[PDB]
RNA sequence: UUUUUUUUUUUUUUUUUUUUUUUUUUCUCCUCUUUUUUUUUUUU
């Protein structure tokens, strides 16, 4: 009840989205997951082999932003 | 040696109809105390 009060009072929504707001999703399905279309591999410039990327991140960091490389 | 007569289960069937959830009261009402109101910053 207190958490609900804190939400309602401070103007924050707790409603999951609607069908048309859901349906517009990238399809990360097991029968066909996501993988880069090769014309965009052309158009970009890969570095997954010639350079090292890693990250320290807080405990529980289910979603990383920060990365660097020197 | 004991004849003859004294009715019985109401008659009738071939009449028209153009609405509609509910329904009808109760008054004015003293919110107690460190504050201006804090605020960059970074790790989600």
């Amino acid at each position: 009840g207190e958490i609900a009060t804190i939400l309602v009072e401070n103007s924050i929504s707790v409603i999951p989205f609607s069908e048309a707001q859901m349906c517009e999703m990238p399809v990360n399905t097991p029968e066909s997951p996501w993988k880069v279309s090769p014309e965009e591999e052309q158009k970009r410039k890969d570095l997954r082999k010639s350079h090292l990327v890693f990250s320290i991140d807080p405990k529980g960091c289910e979603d990383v932003n920060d990365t660097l490389s020197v």
Side-chain angles (χ1 to χ4, degrees):
Chain A
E2 279 99 5
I3 301 174
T5 301
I6 300 161
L7 273 295
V8 298
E9 206 65 50
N10 294 115
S11 289
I12 300 93
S13 194
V14 192
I15 52 169
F17 312 92
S18 56
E19 324 191 14
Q21 186 59 298
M22 185 215 298
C23 84
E24 57 199 309
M25 281 206 222
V27 296
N28 191 359
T29 81
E31 67 271 57
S32 295
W34 176 72
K35 209 65 189 67
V36 183
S37 174
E39 198 280 330
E40 184 66 26
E41 170 60 28
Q42 189 154 9
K43 186 63 65 68
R44 285 198 194 246
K45 179 206 177 191
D46 176 8
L47 272 72
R48 296 143 61 254
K49 309 196 193 304
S50 175
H51 206 72
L52 73 164
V53 168
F54 75 98
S55 295
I56 188 169
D57 279 313
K59 276 75 69 175
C61 176
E62 291 281 79
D63 57 356
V64 176
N65 289 337
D66 57 309
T67 60
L68 280 83
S69 67
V70 169

Short mmCIF file of all heavy atoms in Angstrom, two decimals, chain A residues 6 10-11 31 37 42 44 56:
data_model
loop_
_atom_site.label_atom_id
_atom_site.label_comp_id
_atom_site.label_asym_id
_atom_site.label_seq_id
_atom_site.Cartn_x
_atom_site.Cartn_y
_atom_site.Cartn_z
N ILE A 6 3.34 5.86 -2.98
CA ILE A 6 4.50 6.57 -3.51
C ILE A 6 4.42 6.68 -5.02
O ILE A 6 4.73 7.73 -5.60
CB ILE A 6 5.79 5.86 -3.08
CG1 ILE A 6 5.91 5.79 -1.55
CG2 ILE A 6 7.00 6.43 -3.80
CD1 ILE A 6 6.88 4.74 -1.07
N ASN A 10 3.66 10.54 -6.70
CA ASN A 10 4.79 11.13 -7.41
C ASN A 10 4.63 11.09 -8.93
O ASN A 10 5.60 11.36 -9.64
CB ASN A 10 6.09 10.46 -6.98
CG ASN A 10 6.43 10.72 -5.53
OD1 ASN A 10 6.44 9.81 -4.70
ND2 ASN A 10 6.72 11.98 -5.21
N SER A 11 3.43 10.78 -9.43
CA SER A 11 3.13 10.78 -10.86
C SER A 11 4.03 9.83 -11.66
O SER A 11 4.81 10.24 -12.53
CB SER A 11 3.20 12.20 -11.42
OG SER A 11 2.11 12.98 -10.97
N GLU A 31 13.12 -19.77 -32.48
CA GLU A 31 13.15 -20.30 -33.84
C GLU A 31 13.75 -19.32 -34.83
O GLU A 31 14.22 -19.75 -35.90
CB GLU A 31 11.74 -20.73 -34.28
CG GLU A 31 10.75 -19.60 -34.45
CD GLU A 31 10.02 -19.30 -33.15
OE1 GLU A 31 10.69 -19.00 -32.15
OE2 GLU A 31 8.77 -19.37 -33.15
N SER A 37 21.66 -8.01 -40.50
CA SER A 37 21.54 -8.13 -41.95
C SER A 37 22.80 -7.61 -42.62
O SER A 37 23.27 -6.51 -42.28
CB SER A 37 20.32 -7.36 -42.45
OG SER A 37 20.25 -7.36 -43.86
N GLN A 42 28.29 -4.40 -43.99
CA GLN A 42 28.96 -3.52 -44.94
C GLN A 42 28.96 -2.08 -44.44
O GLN A 42 30.02 -1.45 -44.32
CB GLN A 42 28.29 -3.61 -46.31
CG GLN A 42 29.06 -2.91 -47.41
CD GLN A 42 28.78 -3.49 -48.78
OE1 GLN A 42 27.88 -4.32 -48.94
NE2 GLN A 42 29.55 -3.07 -49.78
N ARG A 44 28.43 -0.48 -41.73
CA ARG A 44 29.14 -0.23 -40.48
C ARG A 44 30.58 -0.72 -40.59
O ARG A 44 31.07 -1.07 -41.68
CB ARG A 44 28.41 -0.87 -39.30
CG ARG A 44 27.15 -0.14 -38.87
CD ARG A 44 26.75 -0.54 -37.46
NE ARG A 44 25.39 -0.15 -37.11
CZ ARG A 44 25.10 0.74 -36.17
NH1 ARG A 44 26.05 1.34 -35.47
NH2 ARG A 44 23.83 1.03 -35.92
N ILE A 56 33.39 -3.18 -16.28
CA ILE A 56 32.94 -3.27 -14.90
C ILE A 56 31.52 -2.72 -14.80
O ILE A 56 31.14 -1.79 -15.53
CB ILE A 56 33.91 -2.51 -13.98
CG1 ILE A 56 33.59 -2.76 -12.51
CG2 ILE A 56 33.90 -1.02 -14.29
CD1 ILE A 56 34.66 -2.26 -11.59
#
